[PDB]
């Protein structure tokens, strides 16, 4: 097939590595491939350097090292282990008095390593560490919401490191400073720094009526030490004002490099904002025996200059992406590594003063557990540590480019507000204005733009083409938001002849605001329209013709696309479809030029230019996190000569290197007997026949045989009181055979456990005595198939205890897992959707003869409702249908770049060329115009769609150019009374299927305290009848239906047992008793020492506990 | 959280009458499980309740006799369809269930305006009124056809929309 | 819609009273095995089965049908409850 593309825009630079925000960050934080002697001070190295040495015996740090993983990646996924590497640390114990030096290398545990694609493996599960976005450290000046002419000064350090400081001018004239919920005159703190009335008079004297409030004679009357003691009495009431104690607190609060830490970014931000330079990252210093100032004087200078109205002093936008930065995986892990290392340091200081003050070694003195616990905590129960989205390659790819404002140090959901949730002008090229969850996290969770990358300070930079005069240089400059605000940046689609600007008046941007400007005033230019949106948003063709809301849907749903077995690339692409499967490690390519030796379903062997033989094992039918089968398929034959970067094996959801999230189906936009009523969708049975929209899903079933005080749990083929018909597909060890078919109720793995000790009821004793069979010692607890599930067993993993290589958690004897897969065809209820935001469920599967069809006898695949189009305002799918139709008969695919894609007249041209193949075939076969085509044409020229008088061929062409063709109703044979738009549309099958969702429950598990039914399909729980549903019944006046829900159908124990008994006996349900949950309320209120009594009309106490609560 | 309550994806049911809704046989089997047990014992599909329930707990042990028995079970009986959020009293409505092949719930088009439910993947819950009293309340007060006007404005709440308006206007 | 629902709403002062009457009458019928019915053999609600048409198992249908006939008496304080129960078990053993 031929691939024709459009667009006049030549984008210089290709998109950066999409997973670079993960890999390049983590590696930069580790420096494991960097020689220890040549290591810089960052991440893990910076953590060791900042926590060392230990003062009081002196323990010092030399260098660290990381060994190789104890197990490979797939072995960790298999054995539920963690992908990590051993961490060793060179330490020398030095006695500050004796001079004794004892050196040793201690083991600190393991550190989780990042895979190639940028994810992790935590205890056998792929996990993605999502980057965090927060307010950059530094000094900001925000207008006081109370007093119009007064402003609030804020000094912000790194999260968890140091308190926030607020400088505010009070109505009483004096400037105040706020630290740790404590306010005091800033004058005192300035005095401690060694400042005098002289220095402040010459420095701040430029602004009158301001510094006089800073002037206080009672402050200068005391020495720096006295003022320091005075300040300590202010911050620490009740605590004895000892000199060295006050020094320790204040230094630790401000000048301490270890406790208080500005960001290296925040350091630069403060330097550029205050027009100064900072030696360290602390607000002050302890030098030559006293405190020396760094930050406080320039900040107070800027503050007073701001209040006075002095030019050159602005407020700060805190949603500005020049004041907002990103904490990647490396920095987040480093910060938690710093915390755990600090706790280890506390253990060191503690153990030095204990035990032998003479005989100690670095090994004895070190406890690795705090560090291990901290790292393990961050990689497990952290919020930013998420379950990897392995639905399709695009899912995980986007997941690694996610940006969260939540997590530790971030925003609480209630602390959010929609000021941060909005889009800023600085989001241009940096953060996608489209992609976001439409849930409660809208605005908080976002995706990174394509061409955007994150610099070392943590800010997001975007590329821009250099423009001097009229010439546009091929060089590119990545800029921050603050830097971008300086220049005038034109559009990417501005006319260029060669490297020279053609237009007389170009469209440009000055600080986000659009401006028509001359080419002589153009400083820079957009690299590409693609940089404005995320990766997913770039996969949507004709994006400029869609509403922003449905575009959000399209970007989000492409993440939800299940990899089909017959999945194919879209007929209308944007060009990034291949690159996605490139950056994502789904596909497989050749490292160098060479020839293919072997080709198999399991492996691909290739001989290169080097002569060396490289064998690539193929991942086949491996269950992902969501259940979507991930397998690689060979695309080369034996002896095929390939080159550098050529396709070897297509991964999941990939076709010839291109991304395949769905299938190209022949669609028809028309109402159909109300079966497409309200976003509903009608499909053809042919889609099931040739297995379109069919995908394989695997599910993991685990069971544990443990040690009980009542006796061991044994996995065996011996299960008491069972028929041989049920033990059919099991082997002799109790495991089901590989390849068998399992249905709900069947036994996957049989297991026996000894019965709990209990007097068998006299009925049971007699029953045993009658049947002449002694009661079995054990009891059946088998892993069976959950209702609504099943399939074919493809694998069985059996781990035990006593056998080599495997040791389970304490108490557990053997762990057995069963992998059951299934091929899922498209059925009524499953969710289909396109890239333009059009979504819906399959409401009907018509036989092929009922389906609306073409004059040549070709039936359409999908019937979409035209009513879904106008209100939703997404016309992209219309153009996709048009160009899809032209490409259907021409037999060629297309590439239509976003905003640079194909335009209508060119589509009309391709439609005309397709029409020649359509009708020219007919007239060549000796077939004239159909009589029904005549009537359709008549009603068409009454519709003003075709010009009257012209020959039917000319009219049919006039319709075909409009994208409309003549359709015949399969049920009648009569045509549709009008021409209908028909063409190929790229439609995906989403992850939401009725097979995963449909659930029903009669009776089941109840909670412990409340004794109400559980929730969810997984727990076989009941549906929640909220207080709103209670209102609905109340508003209706249905009392006995509501009383049912409140008692018999949920919380009433005696009532529900008698109810079930009544129904199976054919008897009517009994009168409902008092709910158990109210009894819980009564006793919980009694625990609060509050007497709650139920009474009658005689005001005499009524016992709802029936004597059980009274003595 | 209550017993005898299921949940599945909704699908348009143009063929249904205003007082009807489509319900999967699987859901109906579990939702009416005790009723199905008694009716099975009434017939010759199983000697008693215990054996009948043991029979249903395995899918391959199910034969057509239990389906036709279930048909006799739910006859005349109605269920309650609920769609969150429940903003007013028509958020819950009574329908006579019609057993269908598939795992989806079929919902009558005209009540989609009352539930404010489209078919872009919406789900619904199915509650089963047990007592004769609860059954009478649903069939009379809460029945879909018995509620045609809005208790808010007095205006028709269940009226032609979308495809229907288009066709008649055409 | 339920057959002749408008007539039933016209029979009572409030629609909820109708619901109570139907429910209680259906309880009497379900308990006494449909032998206390006022419905003539031709008025018996049927059910289509694979075998043949049997009686409608739903007692609520019987109750609303009996109410349509007008052969029933509805009101309050018409008879001692214990008397009504034991008399209905006398005429129609359960």
């Amino acid at each position: 097939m031929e691939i024709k593309r459009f667009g006049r825009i030549r984008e210089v630079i290709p998109l950066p590595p999409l997973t670079e925000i993960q890999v390049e960050s983590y590696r930069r934080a580790l420096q494991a491939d960097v020689p220890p002697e040549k290591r810089e001070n960052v991440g893990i190295q910076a953590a060791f350097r900042e926590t060392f040495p230990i003062e009081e015996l002196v323990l010092d740090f030399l260098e660290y090292r990381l060994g190789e993983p104890p197990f490979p990646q797939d072995e960790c996924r298999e054995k539920d282990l963690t992908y990590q590497a051993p961490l060793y640390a060179r330490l020398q114990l030095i006695h500050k008095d004796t001079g004794l030096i004892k050196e040793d290398e201690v083991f600190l545990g393991h550190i989780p390593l990042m895979t190639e694609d940028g994810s992790f493996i935590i205890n056998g599960a792929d996990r993605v560490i999502v980057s965090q976005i927060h307010r950059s450290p530094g000094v900001y000046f925000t207008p006081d919401p109370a007093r119009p002419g007064r402003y609030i000064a804020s000094i912000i350090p790194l999260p968890k490191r140091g308190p926030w400081i607020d400088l505010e001018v009070e109505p009483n004239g004096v400037v105040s400073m706020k630290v740790n919920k404590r306010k005091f005159p800033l004058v005192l703190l300035l005095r401690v720094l060694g400042y005098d009335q002289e220095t402040l008079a010459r420095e701040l004297g430029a602004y009158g009526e301001l510094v006089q409030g800073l002037m206080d004679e009672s402050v200068f009357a005391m020495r720096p030490e006295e003022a320091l003691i005075r300040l300590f009495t202010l911050l620490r009431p009740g605590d004895p004002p000892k000199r060295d104690k006050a020094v320790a607190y204040v230094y630790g609060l401000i000048a301490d490099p270890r406790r208080y830490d500005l960001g290296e970014a925040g350091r630069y931000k403060a330097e550029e904002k205050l027009g100064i330079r900072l030696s360290g990252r602390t607000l002050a210093r302890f030098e030559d025996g006293e405190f020396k100032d760094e930050v406080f004087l320039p900040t107070l200078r800027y503050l007073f200059a701001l209040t006075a109205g002095v030019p050159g002093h602005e407020v700060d936008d805190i949603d500005h992406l020049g004041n907002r930065r990103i904490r990647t995986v490396g920095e987040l892990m480093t910060d938690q590594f710093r915390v755990g290392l600090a706790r280890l340091a506390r253990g060191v200081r503690e153990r030095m003063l204990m035990g032998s003050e003479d005989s100690l070694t670095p090994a004895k003195l070190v406890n690795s557990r705090p560090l291990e616990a901290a790292i393990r905590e961050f990689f497990s129960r952290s919020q930013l540590s998420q379950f990897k989205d392995e639905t399709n390659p695009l899912s995980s790819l986007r997941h690694k480019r996610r940006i969260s404002a939540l997590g530790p140090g971030g925003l609480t959901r209630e602390r959010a507000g929609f000021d941060v949730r909005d889009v800023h002008r600085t989001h241009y090229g940096r953060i996608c204005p489209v992609e976001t969850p439409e849930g409660a996290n809208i605005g908080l969770i976002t995706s990174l733009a394509a061409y955007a990358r994150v610099d070392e300070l943590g800010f997001i930079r975007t590329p821009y083409r250099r423009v001097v005069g009229g010439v546009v240089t091929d060089e590119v400059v990545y800029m921050t938001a603050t830097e971008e605000d300086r220049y005038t940046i034109a559009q990417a689609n501005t006319p260029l002849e060669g490297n020279r600007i053609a237009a007389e008046r170009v469209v440009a941007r000055r600080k986000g605001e659009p401006v028509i400007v001359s080419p002589e005033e153009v400083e820079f230019m957009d690299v590409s329209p693609k940089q404005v949106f995320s990766v997913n948003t770039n996969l949507i063709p004709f994006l400029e013709h869609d509403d922003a809301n449905r575009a959000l849907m399209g970007s989000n749903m492409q993440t939800q696309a299940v990899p089909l077995i017959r999945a194919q690339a879209p007929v209308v692409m944007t060009g990034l479809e291949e690159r996605v499967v490139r950056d994502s490690l789904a596909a497989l390519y050749a490292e160098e030029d060479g020839e293919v030796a072997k080709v198999d379903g399991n492996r691909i062997v290739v001989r290169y230019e080097d002569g060396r033989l490289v064998e690539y094992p193929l991942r086949r039918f491996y269950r992902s996190n969501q259940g979507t089968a991930l397998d690689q398929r060979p695309r080369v034959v034996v002896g095929q000569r390939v080159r550098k970067g050529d396709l070897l094996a297509d991964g999941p959801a990939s076709e010839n290197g291109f991304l395949a999230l769905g299938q190209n189906v022949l669609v028809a936009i028309m109402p159909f007997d109300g079966y497409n009523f309200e976003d509903a969708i009608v499909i053809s049975e042919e889609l099931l026949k040739r297995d379109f929209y069919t995908s394989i899903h695997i599910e993991r079933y685990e069971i544990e045989a443990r040690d009980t005080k009542l006796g061991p749990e044994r996995i065996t083929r011996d299960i008491p009181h069972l028929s041989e018909a049920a033990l059919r597909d099991l082997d002799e060890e109790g495991v089901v055979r590989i390849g068998a078919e399992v249905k709900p109720g069947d036994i996957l793995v049989g297991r026996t456990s000894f019965k709990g000790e209990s007097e068998p009821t006299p009925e049971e004793r007699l029953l045993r005595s009658i049947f002449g069979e002694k009661a079995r010692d054990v009891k059946d607890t088998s892993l069976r198939v959950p209702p609504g599930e099943g399939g074919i067993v493809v694998r069985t993993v059996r781990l035990r205890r006593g056998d080599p290589g495997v040791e389970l958690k304490p108490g557990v004897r053997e762990v057995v897992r069963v992998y059951v897969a299934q091929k899922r065809k498209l059925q009524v209820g499953d969710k289909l959707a396109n890239r333009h935001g059009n979504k819906g469920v399959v409401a009907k599967i018509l036989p092929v003869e009922d389906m609306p069809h073409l004059p040549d006898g070709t039936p359409v695949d999908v019937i979409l409702n035209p009513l879904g189009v106008p209100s939703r305002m997404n016309l992209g799918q219309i153009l996709e249908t048009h160009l899809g139709l032209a490409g259907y008969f021409l037999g060629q695919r297309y590439i239509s770049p976003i905003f640079d894609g194909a335009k209508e007249p060119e589509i009309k041209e391709l439609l005309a060329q397709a029409f020649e193949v359509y009708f020219g075939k007919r007239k060549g076969e000796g077939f004239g115009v159909d009589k029904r085509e005549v009537e359709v044409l008549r009603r068409a020229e009454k519709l003003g769609l075709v010009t009257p008088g012209k020959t039917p061929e000319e009219q049919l062409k006039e319709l075909f150019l409009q994208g409309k063709v003549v359709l015949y109703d399969g049920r009648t044979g009569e045509p549709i009374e009008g021409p209908i738009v028909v063409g190929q549309m790229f439609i995906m099958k989403l992850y939401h299927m009725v097979e995963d969702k449909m659930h029903a429950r009669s009776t089941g598990p109840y909670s412990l305290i409340t004794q109400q039914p559980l929730g969810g399909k997984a727990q076989f729980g009941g549906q929640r009848f909220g207080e709103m549903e209670v209102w609905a019944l109340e508003a209706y006046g249905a009392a006995h239906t509501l009383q049912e829900m409140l008692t018999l159908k949920s919380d009433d124990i005696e009532g529900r047992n008698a109810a079930y008994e009544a129904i199976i006996k054919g008897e009517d349900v009994p009168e409902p008793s008092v709910p158990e949950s109210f009894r819980v309320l009564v006793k919980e209120l009694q625990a609060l020492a509050l007497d709650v009594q139920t009474l009658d009309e005689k005001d005499n106490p009524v016992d709802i506990f029936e004597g059980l609560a009274s003595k | 959280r209550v017993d005898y309550s299921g949940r599945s994806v909704i699908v348009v049911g143009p063929q249904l009458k205003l007082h009807q809704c489509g319900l999967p046989k699987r859901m109906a089997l579990e939702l009416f499980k005790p009723f199905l047990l008694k009716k099975m014992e009434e017939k010759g599909i199983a000697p008693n309740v215990k054996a009948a329930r043991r029979m249903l707990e395995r899918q391959r042990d199910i034969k057509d006799e239990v389906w036709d028995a279930l048909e006799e079970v739910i006859h005349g009986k109605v269920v309650l369809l609920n769609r969150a959020p429940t903003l007013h009293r028509l958020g819950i409505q009574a329908f006579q269930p019609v057993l269908v092949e598939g795992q989806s719930i079929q919902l009558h088009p005209l009540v989609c305006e009352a539930f404010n439910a489209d078919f872009d993947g919406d789900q619904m819950a199915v509650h089963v009124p047990l007592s004769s009293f609860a059954q009478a309340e649903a069939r009379i007060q809460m029945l879909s056809a018995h509620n045609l006007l809005s208790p808010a404005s007095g205006e028709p709440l269940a009226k032609p929309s979308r495809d229907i308006i288009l066709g008649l206007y055409y | 819609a339920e057959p002749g629902i408008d007539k039933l709403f016209g029979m009572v002062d409030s629609k909820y009273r109708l619901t109570v009457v139907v429910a209680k009458r259906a309880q009497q019928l379900l308990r006494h095995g449909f032998k206390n019915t006022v419905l003539e053999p031709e008025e018996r609600p049927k059910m289509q089965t694979l075998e043949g048409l049997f009686d409608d198992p739903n007692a609520v249908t019987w109750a609303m049908k009996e109410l349509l006939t007008g052969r029933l008496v509805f009101g309050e304080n018409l008879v001692p409850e214990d008397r009504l129960q034991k008399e209905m078990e006398r005429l129609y053993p359960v």
Binding site: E1034, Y1036, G1037, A1038, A1039, H1040, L1042, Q1043, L1046, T1047, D1051, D1052, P1072, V1074, P1075, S1077, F1078 | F133, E137, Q141 | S14, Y16, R17, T19, V20, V21, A23, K24, R25, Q28, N36, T37, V38, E66, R71, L72, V73, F74, G75, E76, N77, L78, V79, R83, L84, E87, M88, R90, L91
Partner: peptide
């Protein structure tokens, strides 16, 4: 969890009784 005082739970319509004419006459004459 008691019966709500509205609709079928209202004392106005709650205590209504049903009786067929055959049983009606049976208790009347007795």
């Amino acid at each position: 969890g008691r019966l709500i005082p509205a609709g079928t739970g209202s004392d106005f319509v709650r205590f209504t009784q049903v009786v067929d004419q055959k049983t009606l006459k049976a208790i009347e004459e007795a």
